[PDB]
């Protein structure tokens, strides 16, 4: 599985930013058996899942960032778009594209090349 995060940079407080990437090294059929998502890591923090979309098409968020964060998934194009609005300084962190794959009594968590995002005036 290959991922390449597109988008990021500096934004003002209250602004909006959209991140998205196309799953690479994986077919559509395989992807549909996987959950697309993102991970957050600020300086000194561990990488943690913040948003994802299920096999069954459901979207789920870490409640802390719900609303200000939004995710949509296009299975045909193998695209997951992480929309964010009303950004605040605490949100500054590098965000990584991730794919969760189910396996026999096991799972595989893949990582992309994260993109830095900063929120300052």
């Amino acid at each position: 599985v290959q991922l390449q995060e597109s988008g990021g940079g500096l934004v003002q407080p209250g602004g909006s930013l959209r991140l998205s990437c196309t799953a690479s090294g994986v077919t559509i059929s395989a992807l549909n058996a996987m959950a697309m998502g993102w991970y957050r890591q600020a300086p000194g923090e561990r990488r943690v899942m913040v948003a994802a979309v299920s096999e069954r098409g459901n979207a789920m968020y870490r409640e802390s960032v719900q609303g200000r964060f939004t995710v949509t998934r296009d299975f045909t194009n193998k695209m997951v778009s992480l929309q964010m609005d009303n950004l605040k300084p605490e949100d500054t962190a590098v965000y990584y594209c991730h794919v969760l794959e189910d396996r026999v009594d096991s799972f595989h968590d893949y990582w992309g090349q994260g993109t830095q995002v900063t929120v300052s005036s």
Partner: peptide
């Protein structure tokens, strides 16, 4: 819930 979604819950727990 599906098993994969249970795992997602756990992940969001960490």
């Amino acid at each position: 819930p599906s098993r994969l979604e249970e795992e997602l819950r756990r992940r969001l727990t960490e």
